Subunit: 25 residues, 4 copies
């Protein structure tokens, strides 16, 4: 388990990457 | 809970993203 | 130890960086 | 505490940001 803030950052970073890729596709 | 260094990195990454977005808005 | 989602994000971020560098080299 | 791989990713990400900023300064 992780600090909730670290969980939140991790979700944000993954979503960031997915959106960036979709934007380029 | 997380290593303090991981907490720090997570805060930095979120702030990074917020600043980048504000810069573009 | 970390939340599995944080582990996954960390692996993704490292791979992201490695691919970006290889792309530029 | 965190998974060592998460610690490593966090260090890499911070160093990444510091290098990127120094490169731009
Ligand atoms: C298109 C807009 C996209 C915006 C993405 C950037 C969003 C930035 C906002 C981040 C909010 C983080 C929410 C964080 C929510 C969890 C905070 C918490 O309760 O921490 C407690 C622990 O420390 C206890 O150990
Ligand atoms: C260019 C923008 C790219 C980012 C787009 C993101 C859009 C949606 C924003 C995502 C923020 C989701 C943060 C969600 C973070 C939830 C943290 C959590 O797990 O709650 C606490 C538990 O750990 C138990 O205490
Ligand atoms: C506009 C400038 C923006 C600069 C952003 C980049 C900043 C880079 C500096 C990072 C400082 C990280 C602070 C880290 C502070 C926590 C360190 C710690 O005590 O770790 C102990 C644990 O390992 C025990 O398990
Ligand atoms: C382009 C620059 C984008 C980044 C801008 C960032 C500006 C502000 C810098 C943020 C650094 C905040 C790091 C703060 C990290 C605090 C770590 C902590 O939580 O203390 C230890 C506890 O976990 C308990 O031991
Ligand atoms: C070239 C394409 C590259 C795509 C990279 C982006 C991929 C985005 C997808 C992310 C999938 C994340 C998998 C996450 C797998 C672990 C989820 C989990 O079981 O969490 C449980 C814990 O919360 C219990 O505490
Ligand atoms: C521009 C694309 C850059 C990203 C390319 C990534 C391509 C490959 C995708 C990587 C996703 C790997 C996620 C793998 C995450 C595994 C999480 C895990 O460790 O399982 C659970 C355990 O913690 C125990 O419960
Ligand atoms: C200028 C080049 C910059 C390259 C930056 C990218 C480097 C990519 C390489 C990453 C190596 C990660 C090292 C990771 C070292 C810790 C691995 C580990 O022992 O994990 C065990 C835990 O899972 C047990 O729970
Ligand atoms: C554009 C390149 C930007 C990245 C430049 C990075 C250059 C230096 C590379 C950094 C990799 C450092 C990874 C160091 C990761 C150490 C993980 C660790 O803490 O060991 C295990 C403990 O947690 C206890 O088991
Ligand atoms: Ca932990
Ligand atoms: Cl963690």
């Amino acid at each position: 388990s992780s600090d909730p803030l670290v969980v939140a950052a991790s979700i944000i970073g993954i979503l960031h990457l997915i959106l960036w890729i979709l934007d380029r596709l």
